[model samples]
Each structure stands twice: as C-alpha cells, then as structure tokens.
Target chain A: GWVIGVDPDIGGAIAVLSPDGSSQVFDNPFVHIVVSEVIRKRLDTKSIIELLRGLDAPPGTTAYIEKSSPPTDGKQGWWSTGFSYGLWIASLVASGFSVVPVASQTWKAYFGLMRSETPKDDSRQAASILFPDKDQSLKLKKHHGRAEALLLAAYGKGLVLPSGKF
Target chain B: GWVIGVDPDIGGAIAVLSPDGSSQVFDNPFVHIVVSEVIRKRLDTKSIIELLRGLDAPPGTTAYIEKSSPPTDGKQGWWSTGFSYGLWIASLVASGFSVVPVASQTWKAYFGLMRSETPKDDSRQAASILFPDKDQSLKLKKHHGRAEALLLAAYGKGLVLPSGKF
Candidate 1:
C-alpha cells in the first residue's frame, strides 16, 4: 500500500583521527531512515545497502560507516518487503552509513549538515571503524539533535543492533 | 511593485549566421538571451555573457543565440526584471538551450521553435515548452498537444529557418 512510517534515528561518536586511533568525533551527527511497509512481508538488506550507497556522502569529504540497524521486531505483513526493498536503503543513507547513498535520506541530512564546516565522508569508510553498539549509547547522547533523538529511540527499543542467530 | 506588463513585443530577432561576416555560427538549435534592465538594473552584460560562456559545454555541441527587443520601446521594471533575470535563464535551461544564449529575442523565438518537438521529449520537458505559449496564445495553435502547438507557433511566426534571424 503505502509507507506507514519513517523515523530517522541517527547517533554515534566520532574520532577525528590522527591516522592512529586517537580521533575525536565532535558531536557525532547521524540520521536514521526508518520505514514501515504496509505490504510485501520481507526485508531485503542488499537492496537497502545498495540504496544507501548511492547518495552523495555528506561532510562531502570521506565516509566512514559508524553502524546500520534494520527493522527487528515489526510484523512481516505490517512491515517488511517494501521496507527492505526501499525504506531500509533510505534509512542507511539517512543514518549516514554509506558514501554514495541511493536513498533520499542524504538530501534531508544535507539541509542540516551543510551548516557545518565539516563534510561527512562516504558510508564504506564509516563502516570500516567500530560502529557504536548499545553500550556506545553514550556517543549518541553526547550529540543531541533531531538525528540523535531518532537513534536514541531505536536503541531504547533494542533496535541498536539486530542480534544474529549464528 | 508588480509586474505591470511583460511586453514580449520588445524582443527582436537574431541572425543565425554572422551578418558581420567571418566566423560562421554553428546551425545547432539556439536562442540569444539579452533582456532589458527591468530586474537587475546594473547587471553587466559582459559578466552575464562571461558566466554563460563559462557554463559546462559538453562535446558534440555547437553555439546558439537568443535575442529580445531592446530597452527603447520597453521600460524595464519589476516584472521586466524577474522575467529578464529568472524566467529568462530558467526557460533557456528548461528548453535545453546553450549556456550562452547571445540574444533575448532569439531565445524567445528558439523556445517558440522547439514547441513542436516538445511532445516528443519527456513529459516534464514537453510541459515546459507547452501550456502558456501554445495553449494560450492566439498566435500559436496546436494540432497535437501543447508542444506541437508551440512548434507550430514558432513556424507560423516565421522564426524557423536553416539560416535566419531569431
């Protein structure tokens, strides 16, 4: 049917590196593109990743993936296929997960991020570093804003990192 | 104040070839754009021309020109200014005109000329060429949709030519 929901929850800590590990992430800014699909009870991570990788990496310089989170506790019928198909991609890009984010999230973040002196890098690079986990919630709290609120809500609900059944 | 009147009548014609003799003008589609000081009173033509020339000119393309009526019969004001500054530039790009449309009158005529083929282009492109000119003008008529009407209007106006003034 239609996209039932989209909540951008972005948070994390930054470490402005010295090419070592002593980098300081000044007010980790991020975004979350949450989506609820009314149809297609399925989640497609590949498609979503592809979408997020198709955007212009904000902070316009380099991109380092801090982390990415997908829908975990939603009904397949209530939200899955479309979310995985489209919204998830939008979410990653919104969360600033990829360098070339295909999703529309980049544009939204850009409106806010453009005000900064720093341009965000691409997602692949962002992914290279250790992403903020549930324990790393403190990183997000350090930076309070629209994206931070979204990430906080997700973390509170254990949407921080979808546990895998290995 | 308001845009009292947009005297499209002030626009003039441009020669597709060099009437001054010497450097031959390429026969690619073109419309010269040079409007009155209605909007930007002190806008330097030299700067504008320079900006235009500096635009990204891709390969496999030649130059085009657009001309308009001069300031004597036309009193440049608000509507004149907006039309001259905003609409003029927007129209040129929308119509796929070259970056440096040398004359305003030629630009109008060129826009008028492309009306016919607009139908063949994308829907948005066709819409850009249609509506106002072909649908509203008594001078322009349509056999098909707005695009055809505009093209016909350009032809009817005698602006179409292998080598002629705009």
Candidate 2:
C-alpha cells in the first residue's frame, strides 16, 4: 500500500517518479524547505531519516527515499517498518533503490536511533535543524531517540561557574 | 532600574489610591498575561530591557507607591517592574494576540487584557513565514501565525496550491 524508493544524488536529480506513473521525475525545492522548516521548528536537530519522515505525502507512502542503499558506503540511513498506532510505515535513506525493513531485529536497531525512552532528549540529530529559526525544546520532550540527540547538539543548557552556579 | 506594581484587581481602597501615585498602572487583562510571561522569560524576552536599565526590581516596591496604598493591592517578585517600554509595546500584542491567545484576554485584564507586540524584529516575522512547518495545516497557521498562514491562507508564488483553489 506504500511506495518506497531513493535517489542517491537527490541533490543532483530534482524529479521523483510520480506514483501514478503519469509524469516524469521532478524536484520541488519549496516543498523541501517548508517541510524542513516544520521539522526545525519542532525539533532542534535531526538525522536524514527523520527529515524525510516529517514531510507531507500520501499515507503509507515512503516516497521520500528512492532506494535501499545509503548515501555513503559506511554510513547508511538507519530505518524501520511496522505498525505503530495506525501508521503502517517504512523508514530508510534515499539512494535510488528500494529497501524493506527487517522485522523485530531491524526495528530494534531503529529503536536505538529513532525511538527510545528514559533518556534526555535533545533536538539536534535531524538535517532539518539546519534551517536556523527552529525551536525543538517542546517537541524534543515528545521523542526520545534521534530527537534527543538533536536537542543535545543544538544548544547547551548553561555553564556552571567556579562557585557551582549555572 | 526595574520596577513593577501589580494590582490583582482594580478594586477596593487601594485601586482608589493607585490614581494618587501609581504612575504606571495598566488596566488591560490581556496585556498582563503578555507582561507576566515576558517577565518569566526574562533572559530571552528582556535582553533589550536589561541593556537599557541598570537594575531590575519587582512590582512590590513600597517606594513606587504612596505610603497609604494597600499592601494587598500589589504584588512584587524577581526582576518585574512597572516601567513602560512606551506605547510601542502595545503593537506587539495587537498583532500576535489574535482572537484568543492563551485563553481569553478579558480574564487577565484584572483579569484585563494587555497583550502588545512592540518589541519584535523583522527577522522573526519574516523567518516565520519563509520557514513554516508543512505538517501544520492552514487553520493552525492562523493560530500559530505567519509562515504556515502564508501557505494556508493565501495562494501566492511557490505555494503548493499556487492558485487559491483550496
């Protein structure tokens, strides 16, 4: 019910294959910017995967990534596929290929990066955080995985002086 | 120096004496909410105020009011002050405090309203639009203001619905 794919060099090619197979591929920079901004306002930082997920598209469509491969050989996009609440979805990178997320094992791996609990969440792990005017402090409290990493990297709380002050 | 004198209700004998010497008495309930939140987030909201004033004091200064003023009529705490940033401060609220910003402004007037937007810079406003969240639909845009509003409210250049069909 969902379409997933990736283009290794999205920066180079601007078009996506229309799901209906009616049109040629294309890139929409404006859509990219606004989607990125929304994520930025909600979170301090984010990884590549989180950036793609935050976009607006058809439900159950992993149209964000066009591939199963990673951007770099050593650093692939960490992703997952499953039913949480009612969102039956897949998460991965955009490398010009399709990827199917492995079950509990892949889910566990994604959990370590995208979802978790009991840890201090900082909002600096997403690429969306690059757009400047974002404030993830509120949303960071809602997520505990990569969102936490992003918040932590975005801003330091404060410093304690020699007299034990913050 | 910072000075503030809050009269929970513009009532009783103290409200009577306030006219005698309380030079900075504000009567709007909405403005009070903005003022209170402004005071609470001093570090972020009052940087300019701090730069202009050397010291800050709460609204409870006995010196600010006449000796006969009712102690129950005013409140004082932290860097709160009754000082005016001038009529300009009112403009900030006029724009930001739409129909209902944080409950009804009427309740805070004495529960009176005192929201103002006299301290904003162009960057925050412009950035809000250019970088609004895509997931946040149009109705929420008005409540949140600007960015998404530009997308949801109007059909201009680059908007997804470039024509006002929606």
Candidate 3:
C-alpha cells in the first residue's frame, strides 16, 4: 500500500512512500508576507489540490498527518497553526486519501527522536540517514520540510506493512 | 453584481444574493457524532466544493465570509472554530470566488444589529424583514444560519451598491 505523510504547515512538506520503499516529497507552496514583525500567509487551495492530483496517487491511499499542537512561541491567532492543519485535512480528504491524524511525538518515537527544541534538525539528519540516495533533495537546512515529510511517510510504511499485500 | 455570504460553521449556511434582490442559500453539509458528551464534526470538502460549483456563479464574483471569532461557549480545539473558518476560505477561493473576510460585528452593525447574546435571533429577524418575500425560508429559529448568510450578502450589496453598474 502507498502511504502519504504530511507536515501540514506552510513551511512543511508532503511525502508519498511507495510499495517499493521509494519516496517522493513535495514542499507546501505557501506564500507569506512579513510586515512590522507580523506574518500573514496566503494559502492557495488550488495549488495544494493541484500538487496532490499531480502525484497520481491511486484509490485507498492513506495519509498520516501531523496533528496540530498548541501554539506557543506562536502568538498569532487567526490563520495560524490551526488554520494550516485544517487546510491540509480538507485538501487531503478532498483529494481522495483517507486521513489518519498522528501526533508529532507518536511517529518521532518510532525512530528515537523527541519533540526537541530543534525538531527540524533531527528530522533532517534522520532523513539523510534513511534516504541517503536522495541526498541532493534533503541536503539543505531549508529542506527540513522535505525531510520531515519523508520521515512521516517512512513511518506510515510500518503501520501498513502488516496489512499490506506484501 | 452577485455576492456570496457564508456562515462558516457546521450548523451554518451559504447564501448568494443576486442583483435582482433574489437570493438562494445552502446549509453547510456537515455531519457530527456525539460520544460520551463530546462532539466531533465531519467536514466534507467534496460536498462543499460541489455546492459552490452548483451555484453556477459567474466570474469576478465576490464572496463576503464571516470571519471566525474566538470560540466561547464553544469550548473545543483542533477542528473547532478555526478549522471551519479555514475550510470555508479554502473552499470559496478554490471555487473561483474572491473572498472578503468580514468580522461578525462589522457586517452586523450595518444592519443596526450588535453582537448581542442572541445574535442569531437578530440575524433571523433582519433577514425576514429584508427578504419579506422569502418568509418561508427564514421562518424558523434553526434557520438562523440561512438568515445570517442572506444578511451578509445583503450587507455586501450595500458595499458594492455605489460602484455597481446601477
């Protein structure tokens, strides 16, 4: 079975793990503007939908999405973390994938990683180790989204392994 | 110009007001389940998209959507108030209508209504008067969603009245 992993934030990424243990990741195409130390995001549902459709994912696909945590060090209210989580759910479910909401620590624990102060760094290193062939894609620190997305998908593969037609 | 108004809650409504003082409304196709005194909502993006498309709205149309207020007496997190708000925005914008996020009080004040304890009742009463011809549609308390959606569109009409092709 093919599995999808989503990080559900503007700076996040979406990854699809295939039956052959290969994975592909797509960064969230989110645009934002920062003014006077304030941030505003413009989420395009069209582009989100387009990217998912372009993946050519088949029927009965399952996606593990990171459940949103309370915003701390994240003072914004409207259109903040919760907003992005909902957007991903709506888009993924609408795109024909069954969604499984996963907590960040739940999947991270599988690989001995915790919800650390720099979770992005941990995700990047993990991706580098597990998906060494995709070095170019996960090389930069900015590619944390790609790394997290891939790890999420990798985690999903284990959940479905037993039920899969392997 | 045609305008769309959305009451972005599971028990809400979506309304379209035409240039002819004619209006049409759709109740949000949301389902929920209650288990052990807790409520969980099911928001279907496909149905939402279908409803918006079924309206047959023309190009360059504008939609006035109610901005979600902080949840009070609405104690829930993750897919609660913020979830619905973003869902509405994504669906409306993706469906080809430009969205104009309007605060609850901002639009209500235009109709001499305040953020009263029973704002729903006020909205229902206003809709009945403005659309006296549609009494049957706005006849019930449960139809507050229908009423508010219509009034929001009506409020939008006023904003565009001056620059309109009148």
Candidate 4:
C-alpha cells in the first residue's frame, strides 16, 4: 500500500510514502517562459499522468490533493493556479486511483504546521521533526512542498499528532 | 508611444500595440509536460525581462497587467499562478516601464469582452471586431489571450467603447 499526496502548483510537488515509511518526491511539472521568443515547453501533464499511472498500489493506495482556494485579496495569478489544480484533479481521477481533496488548513492543522503568515520554512521544519530519519530528503528549504505532501500522506494513513487527534 | 497588455497565466499571452494600430502577439512562455520523466525546460523569466527591456517605448509606454484574484472556490494551483503574476509584474517594473495593474473585469468590461462563465472566445471575438485589420493575428481561437492583451493595451491608450466609457 502507498499513501500519496500532491501539491499541484507549478512549483509544488507530489510525494509518495510506502508502507515502510520511505518516501519519494517529484516536483510539479513545469514549462519554460520566454518573451519575444518561441514559447515552447509548457507543463508536462502527460508526465504527471504517467507518474500517477505508475503508482500501481493495487488496493490500498490513497491520494490526498491539497485543495486550492481563491486568492485572499488582489492576487492576480491565482487564476493560473486554479487552472493547474483543475488539470491535476482531472488527471488523478482519470488515473483510476482513490483520491481525496484535503483543505490546506485542515491538513496543516493536523500536522501542527500552522503559521500566521508565510513563515517560509515552518512546514519543512515540522516535516524534519516528524520524519527525522528522512532528513536526507526533507532538509532543504525548497523541499517544503514535498514536506507538505508527505504530511498529507501521513494524514491519509491515519497517523496522529501527539495529542491523538488529527 | 506604445501600449502593452500582459496576461500572466501559463495559458495566457502578452500583446504589444503600436500607435499606428498595428500589433504583435506573444504567448506566455511554457514547457511541455511529460509524464514519468524529467524534462529540464522551464519558464524563462530573464527572457521576459529582457523582452520588456527591449521595448524601448521612449515615452508614453504603459503596461496593463491583468491583476490576479483569489479563486472563487477551493482551487490550489492559483498560488503558483499568483507567483507567476508577481514575476511578470516585477520584471515589467524593473524594465523601467510605467505599469498599471487592471482588474479582469475592469479591462474586460472596457472592451465588452464580458461573459458569465468561460464563454471560450468572447474576448477574441471582441478583439477581432475592434481591430479588424489585425484579423490575421487574432483569428485563431487559441489567441484569446492575445486578443485580451490587445484590448488591454487599447484600454490603456484611453480608447473608449462606443458608449464613451471604458
């Protein structure tokens, strides 16, 4: 059995945790942006589709996708992120995997990864502490998305905080 | 004097219109998504910044960027899009061009590009009608982003709708 979590934004990630507690991380598919030039190399939806297809956990695989919400205020780029979320969700469903959408706050609170503003590395820190043995993978600042994904997987697997509540 | 309109999302575009009413279109930089593989191409922020720098509008060059807003529902990818919006905006500003962030509704309404929900090509239609001479550039259905960008530039140039309001 495998528990998988996805952060679908361009800079986000997808993480898969095996029954043994080992995990693998992959960055979100992305494209190169260029102005006044050939605008090639867009996000690799096909690759993501392939990755999801390869999950092949047979029976006990569950996926938790971090749901996206509208921008809080005057944030224009949210539209693209929303579009990406749609694509990722559609792909997940098409892959024939059992999927669950997890609210950002719900999972964050469950993992004690809460913070007022963008504390930048709080989630990474929490993941480091939670999975100390996985330090080799979760230690970098850029691994925040992977950290969040892993925690989401942990939540799906019914792992609990020290207080015994999600 | 020149007018520029930018759509910051991945599926969006950037359009430049000269004083003579002639125009050029550029799609947002992108990379192709490949499943289960690491394809290294990605969005090139520097190229966009350089493109902005090369505009050389001299005077009266104004940029109208489609300001991003939070999603109306639980959509996650919007965050990445928001980040892209910031990158585009920052590059425009750093290029020394006078920049203006316009709400989607503001510019869409100005050009009668309104539609309740994803009307597909309403904006493209409006752009085609407004600049019939540029039909060659705006004819493709996928050019909606380019059309909107053109309209945004038109709006920035103080062009008004037939009702004299923009």
Error in Å for residue B78 of model 4: 9.2
Off by over 4 Å in 4: A34-42, A70-76, A116-118, A161-166, B1-166
Q: Which is the leading candidate under TM-score?
A: 3
Residue B154 shift from truth in candidate 1, angstroms: 20
lDDT of 2 by residue, B67-154 (tens): 1112232332211221121111211221121111121122122111124342112212332343333223222322222221221112
DockQ leader: 3
Q: What is the lDDT of residue B83 in candidate 4?
A: 48
Q: For every model in order, what is the iRMS?
A: 21.6, 23.2, 3.8, 11.7
Model 2 Cα lDDT, one tens digit per residue, A29-118 = 111323314421111112233344444334433332211222232211111010010011112212122323233223223323235443
TM-score, one value per model? 0.20, 0.15, 0.79, 0.47
Which one wins by lDDT: 1 or 2? 1
lDDT score for residue A141 of model 2: 41
Best-to-worst lDDT order? 3, 4, 1, 2
Candidate 4 or 3, higher TM-score? 3
Give the C-alpha miss distance for residue B30 in model 3, angstroms: 2.8
DockQ of each candidate, alpha-carbon based: 0.02, 0.01, 0.37, 0.08
Better of 1 and 2 by DockQ: 1
- What tens digits encode model 3's per-residue C-alpha lDDT throughout A83-127? 777777777766678888887888788766785677777778777
Model 1: CA > 4 A from native? A1-9, A29-62, A66-69, A72-166, B1-122, B128-166
Candidate 3 whole-model C-alpha lDDT, 0 to 1: 0.75
